Amino acid sequence: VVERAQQVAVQEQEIARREKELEARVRKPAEAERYKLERLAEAEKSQLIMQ
C-alpha cells in the first residue's frame, strides 16, 4: 500500500514532466515548421509573380 501510495506521487510529478517535455518536443517544432513554411511560401510567391 505504501509503495502504490507513493507511486501515485511519482506519476503526479510525471504528468508535469510530460507536460514540459511534450511541449518542447512537439509544440515548438510545430511553430518553427509553420514559420519555415510561411517564409518559403512567401519566397516562392515572390519569385513566381515576377517570373
Binding site: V1, V8, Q11, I15, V26, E38, L48
Partner: protein
C-alpha cells in the same frame, strides 16, 4: 486499499500517457494546417496573377 491506490496511479498514468499527447497532437495538426493553408493561398494567388499577366 492496494487496488484503490492502483486506481489513482493508473488514472494519473493514463493522463500523462494519452491525455496530454492528444492535446499536443491537436496543436501540432492545427499549426501545420495553418502553415499549409497559408502556403496554398499564396501559391494560388501567385498562379492567378501569373494567369492574369
Amino acid at each position: 486499499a492496494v487496488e484503490a491506490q492502483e486506481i489513482l496511479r493508473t488514472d494519473k498514468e493514463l493522463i500523462a500517457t494519452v491525455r496530454r499527447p492528444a492535446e499536443a497532437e491537436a496543436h501540432r495538426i492545427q499549426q501545420i494546417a495553418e502553415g499549409e493553408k497559408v502556403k496554398q493561398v499564396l501559391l494560388a494567388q501567385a498562379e492567378a496573377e501569373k494567369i492574369r499577366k
